[PDB]
Amino acid sequence: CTGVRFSDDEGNTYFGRNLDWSFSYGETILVTPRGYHYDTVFGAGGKAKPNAVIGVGVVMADRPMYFDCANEHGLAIAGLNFPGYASFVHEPVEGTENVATFEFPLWVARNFDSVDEVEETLRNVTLVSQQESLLHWFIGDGKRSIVVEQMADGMHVHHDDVDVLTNQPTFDFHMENLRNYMCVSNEMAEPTSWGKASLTAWGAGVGMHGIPGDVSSPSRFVRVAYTNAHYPQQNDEAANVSRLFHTLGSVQMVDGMAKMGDGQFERTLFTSGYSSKTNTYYMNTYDDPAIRSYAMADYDMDSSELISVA
Amino acid sequence: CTGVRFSDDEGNTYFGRNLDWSFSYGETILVTPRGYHYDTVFGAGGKAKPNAVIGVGVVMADRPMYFDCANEHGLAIAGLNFPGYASFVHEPVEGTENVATFEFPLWVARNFDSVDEVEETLRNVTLVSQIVPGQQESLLHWFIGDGKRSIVVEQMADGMHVHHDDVDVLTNQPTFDFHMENLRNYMCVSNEMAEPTSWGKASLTAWGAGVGMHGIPGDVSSPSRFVRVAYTNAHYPQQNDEAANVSRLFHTLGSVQMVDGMAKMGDGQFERTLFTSGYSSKTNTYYMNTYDDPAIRSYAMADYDMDSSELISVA
Amino acid sequence: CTGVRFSDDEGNTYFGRNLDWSFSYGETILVTPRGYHYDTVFGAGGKAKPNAVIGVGVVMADRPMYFDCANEHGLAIAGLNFPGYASFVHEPVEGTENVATFEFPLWVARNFDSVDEVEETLRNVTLVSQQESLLHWFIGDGKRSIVVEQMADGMHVHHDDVDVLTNQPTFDFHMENLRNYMCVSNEMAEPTSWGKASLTAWGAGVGMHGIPGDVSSPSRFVRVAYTNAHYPQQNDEAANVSRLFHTLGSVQMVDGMAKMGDGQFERTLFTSGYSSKTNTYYMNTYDDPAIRSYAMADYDMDSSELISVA
Amino acid sequence: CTGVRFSDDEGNTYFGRNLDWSFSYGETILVTPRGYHYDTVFGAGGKAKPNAVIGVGVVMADRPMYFDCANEHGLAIAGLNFPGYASFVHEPVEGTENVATFEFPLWVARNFDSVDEVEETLRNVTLVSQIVPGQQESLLHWFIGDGKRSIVVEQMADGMHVHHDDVDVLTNQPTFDFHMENLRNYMCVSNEMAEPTSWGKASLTAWGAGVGMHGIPGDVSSPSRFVRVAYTNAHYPQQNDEAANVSRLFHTLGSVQMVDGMAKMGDGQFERTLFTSGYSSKTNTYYMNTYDDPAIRSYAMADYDMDSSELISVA
Ligand SMILES: *CC(=O)CC[C@@H](C)[C@H]1CC[C@H]2[C@@H]3CC[C@@H]4C[C@H](O)CC[C@]4(C)[C@H]3CC[C@]12C
Ligand SMILES: *CC(=O)CC[C@@H](C)[C@H]1CC[C@H]2[C@@H]3CC[C@@H]4C[C@H](O)CC[C@]4(C)[C@H]3CC[C@]12C
Numbered sequence A, C: 001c002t003g004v005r006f007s008d009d010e011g012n013t014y015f016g017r018n019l020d021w022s023f024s025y026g027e028t029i030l031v032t033p034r035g036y037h038y039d040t041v042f043g044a045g046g047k048a049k050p051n052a053v054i055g056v057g058v059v060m061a062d063r064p065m066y067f068d069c070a071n072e073h074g075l076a077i078a079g080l081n082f083p084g085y086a087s088f089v090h091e092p093v094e095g096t097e098n099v100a101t102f103e104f105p106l107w108v109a110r111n112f113d114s115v116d117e118v119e120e121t122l123r124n125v126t127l128v129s130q131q132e133s134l135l136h137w138f139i140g141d142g143k144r145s146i147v148v149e150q151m152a153d154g155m156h157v158h159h160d161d162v163d164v165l166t167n168q169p170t171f172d173f174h175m176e177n178l179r180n181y182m183c184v185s186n187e188m189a190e191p192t193s194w195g196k197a198s199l200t201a202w203g204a205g206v207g208m209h210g211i212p213g214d215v216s217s218p219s220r221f222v223r224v225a226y227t228n229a230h231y232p233q234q235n236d237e238a239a240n241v242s243r244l245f246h247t248l249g250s251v252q253m254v255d256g257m258a259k260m261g262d263g264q265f266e267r268t269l270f271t272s273g274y275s276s277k278t279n280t281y282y283m284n285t286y287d288d289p290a291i292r293s294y295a296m297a298d299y300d301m302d303s304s305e306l307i308s309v310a
Numbered sequence B, D: 001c002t003g004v005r006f007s008d009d010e011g012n013t014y015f016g017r018n019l020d021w022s023f024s025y026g027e028t029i030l031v032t033p034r035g036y037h038y039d040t041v042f043g044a045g046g047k048a049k050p051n052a053v054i055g056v057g058v059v060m061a062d063r064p065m066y067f068d069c070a071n072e073h074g075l076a077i078a079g080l081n082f083p084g085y086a087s088f089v090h091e092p093v094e095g096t097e098n099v100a101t102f103e104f105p106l107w108v109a110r111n112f113d114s115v116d117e118v119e120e121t122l123r124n125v126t127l128v129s130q131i132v133p134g135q136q137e138s139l140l141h142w143f144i145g146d147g148k149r150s151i152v153v154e155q156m157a158d159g160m161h162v163h164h165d166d167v168d169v170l171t172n173q174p175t176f177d178f179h180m181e182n183l184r185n186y187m188c189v190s191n192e193m194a195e196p197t198s199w200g201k202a203s204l205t206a207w208g209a210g211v212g213m214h215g216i217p218g219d220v221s222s223p224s225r226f227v228r229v230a231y232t233n234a235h236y237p238q239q240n241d242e243a244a245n246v247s248r249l250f251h252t253l254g255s256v257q258m259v260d261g262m263a264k265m266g267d268g269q270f271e272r273t274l275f276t277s278g279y280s281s282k283t284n285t286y287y288m289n290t291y292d293d294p295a296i297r298s299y300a301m302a303d304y305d306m307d308s309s310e311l312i313s314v315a
């Protein structure tokens, strides 16, 4: 999967993700109101007046298990597969704010209003894992974004300058790998000469030659970091939703491109987004590219029950 | 730009093109009914009962200039930019069928029912470049296909080239011979999960799916777009339903779409996939979405009185 | 194999080739004097006073079969494998200068003093093939170089602006393939930014990223065209011999890199060169990188017998 | 720069490095006999009967600053540039063995006989960066190996890292953890002849050898040089004679050599493989050639009175 974040001219948030897998987990748009009472698994704190949050989630037991969610104040968080590198403790620790892995997205969206508050609180947080989900998290608002990678050596809180996250390996690898492609440009290739041979481009795109096209995790990071960094800034909601869905489409997994270990094909089953300017969640699926919208002002946020719209 | 053709299990035609450019020409879904009277520019011969055609294009001097179109029998054609290689005569040749460049997509759709019928007639055809008064010279090559196979028509300075398109895909420059020799570089890429191996004492494994596909280029240049979409079209598992096949078409073309900001033209503007059009012969329907809207709109041959006498242009 | 040509500041010739194969053909430095009488196979013409030539060759029958040779006036020619694309006629044609394939290198070096005379004469030449060797030829002097590709559609005489030749496919492919790499530079990578991320190079070489490193024929052409076009010009014999052998070493085939269809490994068995400034032939082998020299002024050129020095 | 290590069937050591730079430092083959008295800078402990060592370096204050060296027991070490990642303390740490950076190659060669002996002692070692008065701070990592295995010693801001080098090769930046994760991208490249396959209806074949190796990078950047030389060292068939093994060393290092004009430094000059040095433990001989001369010169331990008391520097 792929995580993308950017902003417009007014500091608004635009946040989105792809979900690449073989089978659907019954994903549905889940709205968690503020009047909904949540009992944290390991006795973690939170805001007195919680924030209304929205996203894509299943409803296991009686708890919202968000794949990706955002709150009414512009903060968003998504989780991505990190197996072979993620490593959690299975027992709580006294003296720290203990949050379970599955509740971590719902936790940060309910209580925090900016990425700065998240990076501040994470210094006293233990991620407890009760097959288990081995994930890292992509968190961002209208200003910047951070990556949370919990490994066997501790918790790493990377500042994400390319506003882009992908699966394995570690974030330090992807950032070092980007330096291999620093000369790739979006300018039209300048006519040059190799001895007496004059070389010209057939058209646009030759200056971008070098970017990989495979759907592997390190190569998807490079391709979507390039697209996000070079996409011109927009100043209205319609264009920025198009920008987010087009930027994510550049690393989509088309049926037939690569199998798993189970033998099935990795496919971008759905693509979710979020805009803080309108407080709306967007989503389309592999079988329907139409972009459906789910606004926050269309649900009773002071209600007390999770609503799972189909 | 990219043209794509494949088929389901019943032999129907699934055909689609990406239009990459920096500005629009006012294109629209164009209906050319059977009762419309077309007076060819250079006297080219036509069918007795002409085929009803559907596609995307503009109208000029009451003549449909199709960017791409298809008829009621599952035959489709699209024109893709080919400058610096395409070369046409500007005079008709007596003794052969003389079809102008702009009328070529219309001409093959009205009077032919299969690629075999098409490929035979090109043996006695001369594309004549007639400069449209207010426009520029269109130096294009064409991508024709049906529910069985596809061909490429490249008319260069050394005559006409008609290639059997085995990979069922076409892009821009250079010649089709280059693209197929270029594919031999990426013959080793595989959609199989990467097999764990070892380099001396180091044991290498894959983080996940896609490592075996490493090597496929990811830039939006014409040759790289060719390699990538040829891999995507060849490895997509065959579908059996119409909704699944329409999904395969717009997703295969999405693998080589041009996102705003990716690459500038020679004039300072960005090349974007302005629209994506498609056709299905199982239902005789044209599909189209734009850069501003991924909703796949549908236009069926049955929703238009195809025995009318005038061009129907729907927005 | 690879063919390389360049010149110094005084129009002198520097010409060289690698020979990539599994087994040695008994290659030896062969000197063909001018007093040596040669009987052309199909009755082809030639100069009255022949040119003394030198190169690497075997002595089948009583004819010098040169892999690569040069004459005393600065012209050089080498042959490279072109199977699956080379196609010759097997019967002579009346009215044309008929030269057999194996005699073609010895033919052009004996009679011609410049590349211009070669391109002029080739308009009335038929290459006759009497397993057969399917080759194309790399011919050059101190000014330019040409490629001679005899295919089933006729003879093509390409002007070689990159002064570089490699095996399959056709020359028109390699020249079109070079346009994919026109943005690769030898400048130190300029620090750039992808959003808020500042990208710098670890050191020199990042600007050259994009050039392939495999030893396949199309990729070797690209790598050696880059090296030859960017190698700074030299103004003395010692440096230009180093330039030619280093430029050719950039595409050498090291044991273990790639097998053949027979199962054996392709290895650069030897590397031959030639300088017209000194009229000397240079050569080293895979088992000895020492550069041995064989001057023209050390052999009796007015003699009448081929001397094959070991 | 690149360091390479492999072995024959008898377990001897074959070790070599490429020195890529734009200017020379006056290096030369340096003899440090057993009778030479070295007063370590920070009181590091040494062997009772020290090993006679051979290598390439300079002399400063009557102390051999080895670029790379090896002893009479088949243990070799080389220092490669590692700026922006290497970080050293500038004060000795009481309770541990304190070895200066410039004396590190000398120190491990005089007092150790195997990589196992080495790797154990690093547990109680502190490399201290002492700025040479007239020179700059050397931020290096080291490549140590014998006739069995090799290790990498990277001393960064977060402590010492000692990696088991399974691919038996080392380049410059970045950290060794990056290079080994980077190798997983090229796990699919193969030295086998490419297997004919088909993409839909198109049948792809290889023009010849090397197509299965497609994907290996060819630029002279530090990561790409790592991938390429790791493939060359891992796939070279094992040799049994000394002449064949010396040929393998200088040819494996030739696969990543830097030719004049390929890449400019940050100061405007070209990086060239100034020299290439090597060592063989089957004969206890050092080998070296330069950019101006590919003739492999030999310098054997037996050709020098190794019981002398002074440094022997041969041009
Ligand atoms: C994007 C990527 O590569 C990983 C996608 C799949 C495997 C992930 C994405 C979100 C995951 C959910 C999150 C909610 C719960 C959390 C529980 O701890 C485990 C079950 C759960 C449904 C996760 C399963 C994997 C998941 C779908
Ligand atoms: C997708 C791609 O490669 C870019 C090609 C564009 C610019 C081409 C493709 C179809 C062209 C039309 C065809 C109809 C008429 C023909 C006239 O001769 C010129 C005007 C015309 C509208 C063409 C303009 C360029 C065009 C859209």
Ligand SMILES: *CC(=O)CC[C@@H](C)[C@H]1CC[C@H]2[C@@H]3CC[C@@H]4C[C@H](O)CC[C@]4(C)[C@H]3CC[C@]12C
Pocket (backbone or CB within 6 Å): C001, C002, C018, C019, C020, C021, C025, C058, C065, C066, C067, C079, C080, C081, C101, C102, C132, C133, C167
């Ligand atoms: C460089 C490359 O890829 C091809 C190398 C080998 C296969 C070529 C190079 C020169 C060839 C000689 C040339 C002399 C005669 C010519 C006869 O027509 C056939 C035999 C001959 C020895 C050639 C064999 C192939 C050859 C070594």
Ligand SMILES: *CC(=O)CC[C@@H](C)[C@H]1CC[C@H]2[C@@H]3CC[C@@H]4C[C@H](O)CC[C@]4(C)[C@H]3CC[C@]12C
Pocket (backbone or CB within 6 Å): D001, D002, D018, D019, D020, D021, D025, D058, D065, D066, D067, D079, D080, D081, D101, D102, D132, D135, D136, D137, D138, D140, D172
């Ligand atoms: C090959 C490569 O990566 C480039 C590294 C070069 C510039 C390094 C490698 C060895 C270095 C020597 C080591 C001995 C002394 C140490 C002193 O602290 C500084 C001077 C010295 C000669 C180093 C200079 C840089 C050097 C050649």
